[model samples]
Target: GHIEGRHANPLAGKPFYVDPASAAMVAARNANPPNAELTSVANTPQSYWLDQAFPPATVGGTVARYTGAAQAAGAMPVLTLYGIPHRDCGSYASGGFATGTDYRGWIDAVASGLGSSPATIIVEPDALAMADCLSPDQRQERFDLVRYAVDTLTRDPAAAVYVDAGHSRWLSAEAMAARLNDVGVGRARGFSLNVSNFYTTDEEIGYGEAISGLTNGSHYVIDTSRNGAGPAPDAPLNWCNPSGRALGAPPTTATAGAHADAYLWIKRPGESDGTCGRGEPQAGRFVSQYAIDLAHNAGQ
Candidate 1:
């Protein structure tokens, strides 16, 4: 699936690829009333979260095929790598490579899959800022895996690798900056903010910029997928599918901050955040009502 004559600037102003095969899209089509809001969400682009483990032998092929599809459509594929051991620290999203597996080899496969495609890689959300559940040695290994990912993935100049740096609630900008610095973020493109959280765009800008200066002017991206109404009153604690939230800015390269690369929807909207609100589906299940709730409230 290689591009014979690759765009010299592969990622420049490329549209975010819409995944027609997403569950959200399927739900939108099945709606009896054909709700416009659900259709809008189905049409909007979102990042692909590579959360499951693929067989080592075929992982690269799987990734290559995915990236190639996006390239063929002349759109950018934004991918979130979430296979680190102790992924969510046993929280709702807990799942990963089961440790002692060839996680580094998997990263290599994903990197090889990209070839020359221009894709945005958001490396391991929450791993950087909130791996306190691990021992010092385990935590160091966590850093190494992500560091290896950034270094390996960035080998292709066409790829944009942004390490996930959590949000304002987890760490001070200075502390997050330290974690990023220790993980060798300099080898990658920049950082990503609020992948699955609802922190406002302005709040992410404020938090990210503070960390950017300490990281040698590295650029960053914010996940505006569900931050249109900002955080709920309970905030950081209300992280699990809280109410009164709305979709935020549409994904775009046009950003407000000097160091911000783009506002992205790394976290697909309408997907439940670990059944937190009860009656909601599991972490990644797509609920039409959730999708409608987000789409109907996005007006900022």
Candidate 2:
């Protein structure tokens, strides 16, 4: 029900908090299955896509252990990260803190730790496409941070990184694409959309098309974790979690967004929006009532 990105690795299971060694073993099984037939994990009847979200922080030992496992396993890993220090800073809906001095060090650490291993990186979220919210100076600063991440992480051929655009509801084709250009989309494989929300496939596809046209033809991905049912009729700014949402397709190398690289659970389904009952001041806090509402009602 919770994810501290510090503990997330996408390829593993729900509550997918596994050390590198365990991930490597699981990844090994994924790459070269013991049976030509198949195996199932959880309610899933088969085992196909199992890429890790990102390199979660490890205690001293797991880092070396997982590194060794990945080296031996000889397979690519998937990495996903959403929050950026200045992301959504001072927005009417949400606010974030300054990244401060830790930004460069954090990026360096992640790249150094997971650099040797083959990986796909989903970089900063909504920095582009949503830059309109920021002051021009803030926008430039955000792009600088993104460029730093791309340059630092992709120093190794093992990494393929993509930035994020807001969902179709938040951005236009030309505007979003131009935003990508401003942020150095040339450095990323492309962009990702609908990371934490469930926008319709048609809407997201159009979104991708718009951004791609502006980006010298780079591809894109979507977070299709809950969009099979699409979104509720209410506007996205509303706080209700809505209803009738079901798990969509899992992550994969092929997705509808062209380059269409993948569809992912970048934001794990069923987690509360923020702090529904945690006594937090945020209105978007996660609510079980909201979950129930989403589970039973058709998109309202």
Candidate 3:
């Protein structure tokens, strides 16, 4: 494993900060059934959710607060950037910045908050690979927005940027690689796989290497959270919060061979994968039973 650069190695002794949203969920489920499992998933070192304010006019300070806390704890903070034009194909995770101009300002504020800190940024999950849902002009605009995010957020060398690459099952390796190329993966550290999806590590590793080959051997990360059982193929939508899932490998930069850089819990484990008809509270709210099952069935 390449363990020398800022992006290399496990973040030393740095502990991921548990965001208030996650903490609150754990506390609310304290006396509920499967409390232990629910709490465990909540405390997992996942990325801080960044979809609070659309266009995020004044939330940069809050972003800095969380980033600063993670750095203070001697660990690198991870952020999942979701604010893009036409995000989530107008489905469950649908909201995003209304315009490309607004998105640029929002991204600039986020980058300003980082202020040269060492952080891993997963840019716009499902943005590039899901562009087929958009029109030609919209697709071009999406590419521009993604490039803007990569260029703006990477102003600090300490930040590692990874664009989205859907998942092993969503698109062919070559197709996803082409999309990443169109979205300017050249400016990114790499592309991410299986963000909020359930595909086995081996599956993602194989697909990631193919993408790496197409992208001049660029490195990539996998969202190993809630993939222990892989996806519920029999389940509906294939993207919703499916049952019988478990947590996969924990976050680490010490990865297996190939262009895989790290296995990350890019998607917060306990958070609902949208409403999904699972009686979950909302799109991003924490769902206790689903979390408990993920922890309980992990690695079984």
Candidate 4:
């Protein structure tokens, strides 16, 4: 909080929360040959992704305990909500609510889960950015769903939300702004850039600024999980588990500017980007070698 910024204590002057028992920790120790560097990577604070819709009977308790851990440590936790229908264009990170009604009810449950906690939430990483996947009417419905999510999640007075706006490479500012505008970006705290993608901070911000301009100066965050070596080289589909990528900047709230609130590890670093590469695991599964490589080549 001591750092000068436009937002009011976006991180509340506390370190972000780290889940000590994270799969990354296991991968760190259990790699073919373990590396202490990977341990550090595991210890780093990153966002917890909520991909599955836990039953209403327990979703609130689940989120409450997770946020409570952060509160107990006097830290803020970053959370990603990824249960929107038709998520990820049914590609790598597919699977979500099967219907709009189900998605709305699910969002309500997630909102109840984070009730009154000061967690920073990245809502539906590709929900708005990938709206092109839906038909015209379905796209409108998706917009409504996102807007409803924004309203419901921010119902928690202490919560800060940044609706995901894709990346610098994926969508142009003007086009993406139009999408954000429809999705009611103003309903949330701000917008998020490069969730689970590997684009550099500068370009992400440059693109972010333009979208902000169009969307009434909405603040934003970038997913800095694995962009240090920039995008991959020589792969047919470069965004997948292409070789030679590295961890990006460690998660921090003090970023490019006041408008850019944080550089977050939105995607769990070791999680595979689908089975795009020869030996890569399925999407969302941890790849120990990939984890080691990401930590090993960090900051390159």
lDDT (10s digit) by residue, model 2, range 1-300:
896675322222322122232322343355442421111112121111111222234311333345445446554344554445555554522543245335555566667666566556677666676666678887777777777877787776555577777788777777777767876788767888887677876788877877787798887777775676787677644323445665456556545555566666565343455542344334333333343343343332
lDDT, candidate 3, at 160: 80
Residue-level lDDT of model 4, residues 1-300, one tens digit each, is 497765364654789999867899876767666677678788899888876657545677778888999999888988888888888878878888888888887778778888888899898887888888899998999889888988888899888888888898877899889888887788777898887778788889899888889999888988888888888764567888867888998888778765788888888888888977465688889876777788788742
With a 3 Å backbone cut-off (N, CA, C), the pairs that clash in candidate 1 are none
Give per-residue lDDT, candidate 1, residue 180.
92
What candidate 4 gets wrong by more than 4 Å, as runs, is: 1-9, 29-34, 234-236, 277-279
| Model 3, C-alpha of 275: deviation from truth (Å) | 2.8
Cα lDDT listed for each candidate: 0.84, 0.55, 0.79, 0.83
**Which portions of model 2 show Cα errors greater than 4 Å?**
1-76, 90-97, 236-240, 276-300
- Per-residue C-alpha lDDT of model 1 across residues 155-212, encoded as one tens digit per residue: 8788988999999777889988988998888988789999898888888898888999
Show the lowest summed lDDT stretch of 10 residues, model 3.
6-15
Which ten residues in a row are the worst by lDDT in model 1? 3-12
Q: Which regions of candidate 1 fall more than 4 Å away from where they truly are?
A: 1-11, 277-279
TM-score comparison, 1 vs 3, better candidate = 1
Q: Model 2, poorest ten-residue lDDT window?
A: 41-50
Better candidate by lDDT, 1 or 2: 1
> Looking at candidate 4, what is the lDDT of residue 83?
83
Better structure of 1 and 4 per lDDT: 1
Q: Which lDDT tens digits does candidate 3 get at residues 1-300? A: 877864343333455555545653555456544467666666667887675373467757866887888777777788888888777888878888788888888988898888888788899888888888999999989988888888888897878889988988888998888878877788778899999989899989988989999998888999999788888885566668777788998877667846787888888776777867655556777655666678889732
